Ligand binder design. Sequence first.
Ligand SMILES: Nc1nc2c(ncn2[C@H]2C[C@H](O)[C@@H](COP(=O)(O)CP(=O)(O)OP(=O)(O)O)O2)c(=O)[nH]1
Ligand SMILES: [Mg+2]
Ligand SMILES: [Mg+2]
Ligand code: NA
Length: 322
Amino acid sequence: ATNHNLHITEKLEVLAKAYSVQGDKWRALGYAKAINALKSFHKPVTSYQEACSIPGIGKRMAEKIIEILESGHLRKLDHISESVPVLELFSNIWGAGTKTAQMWYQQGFRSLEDIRSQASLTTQQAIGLKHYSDFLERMPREEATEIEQTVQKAAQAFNSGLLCVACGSYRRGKATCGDVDVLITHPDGRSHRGIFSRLLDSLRQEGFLTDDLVKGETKYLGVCRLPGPGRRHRRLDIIVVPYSEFACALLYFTGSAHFNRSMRALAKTKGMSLSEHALSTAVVRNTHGCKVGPGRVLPTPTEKDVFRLLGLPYREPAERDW
DNA sequence: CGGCTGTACTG
DNA sequence: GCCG
DNA sequence: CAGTAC
Ligand SMILES: Nc1nc2c(ncn2[C@H]2C[C@H](O)[C@@H](COP(=O)(O)CP(=O)(O)OP(=O)(O)O)O2)c(=O)[nH]1
Ligand SMILES: [Mg+2]
Ligand SMILES: [Mg+2]
Ligand code: NA
């Protein structure tokens, strides 16, 4: 729908990122939740009591909401360390998180050029840096489509049965995608094996894969570029999963991140655990509470089965932003 | 006040 | 940050 | 393990 509280959320996201780039992840999280609630509220919040009655907004956040509602500004926004923009700049480099941004800043660096030349970069960060600009641009949905087909085409050349599906923001129907997350599996439950390596080599030869950021037996985080004049380098993820965990893999991979964590929260209450691998029962825990026995798996052939089992009404991918 | 998702590759 |  | 990321 429409965000009847934009005048508020914009001020808030500013403080939210402030805390975020600074490493205060938990406080940032509180704000993120707050903002998602604000956005999806049927009307402009008009009173402090009204704000509080909303889940994810407590005394503290309500105070801020009202001050903006009445002043159109948030005092808090004027006392934000002048280091935030540089920390944001540095943490925008894929592979570089808040600890690295903070390290570089105390070392005196202040620009990507400072980093590029002087600073010490891990192999990933170097890749993150050379593709800085391209990585902040959200690609058109159409380009995501092209990338999914590329992967799927190269994958079917090893097996016609292999199933390739673009997830994340793409399956949620967004018009722009930060990256492309492709999930690959196979109906027979066994053919997905031993093809990951060769599929990557194939795409790497074809020139499509330009750089590798992370290689796992079943997980791949890399960089790609479509054939054609002046195409940008797009960040790409690929995960290969056995057919049995397909529903969960697809659920996890479609996200969003907050929707996922929210489902996993609920899962734990009902005494269960939800992971990209499966929906299970309460894990066994000893006197201290330490995992000692994995819960048994509840078959979930489809995403619908996962919601059903958690007592939740099915939600289309496009309505899973959080 | 303590939890706030669960899991995985890199160095 | 918020919540149980 | 610390850091980063899905
Ligand atoms: N449980 C869990 N799932 C996650 C997490 N991060 C990502 N996922 C899942 C859900 C998420 O949908 C998927 C891909 O993550 P991205 O590609 O980083 C963000 P996307 O939503 O795709 O949108 P984009 O901004 O790319 O256009 O992995 C996380 O922290 N936890
Ligand atoms: Mg994505
Ligand atoms: Mg991704
Ligand atoms: Na980063």
